[PDB]
């Protein structure tokens, strides 16, 4: 068994809200506590909720993308790119927004997993270890992965401020 099609959107939103709130505090952690670190795991739980929200998010996102593809794009190699451009200068800047949004999510996954699979996951995560070499090729290290990952989160939050105001503008 499964459910209605809007479940697989409210999920992503739930995942998104969690990956943001948690990922935020992985980089700018909450105030410090004090006790006996045997019985305390606050930061560890934030990271855990993050990685596994990122698991769910990743699965849902990829199935949700697989269908839009199979179904022609949306509506029920740079040619199409250069042509998207001519008709693009005349709602055409709103599609490129929803597209950029799904492009970010995938970037947040490629980068997010490069970090997660690092300490020798040694299985199906083998490709993500090109992302690392790439950032090294850039003349950087895995710290840059963290930085670009944190940036992606802010960029997503930008669309969300737009996409939310744009939706609430459908309070006709």
């Amino acid at each position: 068994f499964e459910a209605p099609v809007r479940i697989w959107h409210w999920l992503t939103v739930l995942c998104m809200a969690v990956l943001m709130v948690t990922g935020y505090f992985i980089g700018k952690p909450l105030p410090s506590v004090s006790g006996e670190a045997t019985y305390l795991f606050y930061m560890g739980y934030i990271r855990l909720i993050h990685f596994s929200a990122g698991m769910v998010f990743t699965v849902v996102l990829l199935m949700r993308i697989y269908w839009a593809f199979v179904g022609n794009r949306y509506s029920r190699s740079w040619w199409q790119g250069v042509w998207y451009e001519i008709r693009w200068y005349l709602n055409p800047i709103a599609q490129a927004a929803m597209f950029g949004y799904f492009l970010m999510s995938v970037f947040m996954i490629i980068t997010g997993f490069a970090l997660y699979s690092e300490h020798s996951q040694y299985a199906i995560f083998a490709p993500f270890r090109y992302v690392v070499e790439f950032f090294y090729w850039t003349g950087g290290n895995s710290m840059d992965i963290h930085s670009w990952h944190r940036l992606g989160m802010w960029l997503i939050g930008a669309f969300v401020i737009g996409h939310v105001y744009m939706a609430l503008r459908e309070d006709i």
Partner: protein
């Protein structure tokens, strides 16, 4: 010149591991402790005098320096067989202990033996070996547990008491906060693996060869207070976990009787980040794979 503080070091039922540990001290060297910080006035393991000469030394020191010497105690007194499980000068060791403690200003309980009871006190404790604080009740006793305690911890506690001219601050149990304030598990360099859910499952597996956590091999780090994970052993060369064996819990009271050393510790919170998130991912990947029809 300057007089050094008189120290009387007596031995009950023990393995002499604590004395051995003491002389392993890297800084200050045991040589310099004996030469310059203290006056080791009685110590069966090292002293020249034996027999009646040794007895004379003992009597002379505790009488002359009455109320002014430090009593260091290694091992513990047996209550069984009227105390004759440990005989000193033809008499129960406990009599020596009591006589020594009556004139001491303060008492150091070296190791798990003096602190708690250690191996001889394990089930069924044939000799009724008893920790010092159960016998001596009217004197400050500083417990320095471990089997044995870390050499440099021992000397540091000594240097502290000499330099600062006072006893170290202690927990409710009488252990110095400085070295026993935290758990092995709270300063273990393998926590990263613990926290990720990366464990050694059998000796010399790939996990073991990468130095993964030893929680599932019975490590009693999570319930053991000591400095082994920070201060380390033998001039900071290693400690049990670093060389691949889990903590036995040797600084803790009755640790011998806390089940097998290769049995997992209980009531310790443990939820791995990568172990949980790997499960969450496959659970979700397998739910979808079932519905699409590419199961297995």
């Amino acid at each position: 010149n300057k007089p050094r503080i008189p120290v009387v070091w007596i031995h009950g039922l023990e393995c002499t591991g604590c004395t051995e540990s003491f002389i392993r001290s890297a800084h200050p060297l045991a040589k310099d402790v004996i030469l310059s910080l203290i006056s080791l006035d009685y110590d069966d393991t090292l002293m020249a005098a034996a027999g009646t000469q040794a007895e004379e030394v003992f009597e002379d020191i505790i009488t002359q320096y009455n109320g002014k010497y430090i009593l260091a105690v290694e091992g513990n007194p047996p209550l069984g067989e009227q105390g004759m499980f440990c005989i000193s000068s033809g008499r129960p060791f406990i009599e020596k202990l009591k006589r020594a403690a009556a004139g001491a200003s303060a008492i150091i309980a070296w190791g798990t033996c003096a602190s708690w009871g250690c191996v001889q006190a394990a089930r069924p404790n044939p000799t009724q070996a008893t920790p010092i604080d159960k016998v001596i009740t009217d004197k400050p006793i500083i417990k320095v547990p471990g089997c044995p305690p870390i050499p440099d911890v021992m000397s540091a506690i000594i240097t502290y008491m000499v330099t600062f001219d006072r006893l170290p601050d202690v927990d409710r149990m009488g252990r110095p906060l400085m070295f026993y304030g935290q758990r092995i598990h709270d300063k273990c360099y393998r926590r990263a693996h613990f926290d990720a859910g990366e464990f050694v499952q059998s000796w010399d597996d790939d996990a073991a060869r990468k130095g993964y956590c030893l929680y599932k091999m019975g490590c009693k780090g999570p319930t053991t207070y000591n400095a082994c994970s920070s201060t380390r052993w033998n001039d900071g060369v290693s400690f049990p976990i670093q060389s691949g064996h889990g903590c036995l819990g040797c600084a803790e009271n009755g640790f011998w009787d806390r089940g097998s050393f290769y049995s997992r510790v209980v009531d310790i919170p443990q939820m791995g980040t990568h172990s949980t998130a790997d499960t969450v991912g496959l659970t979700a990947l397998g739910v979808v794979a079932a519905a699409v029809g590419v199961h297995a």
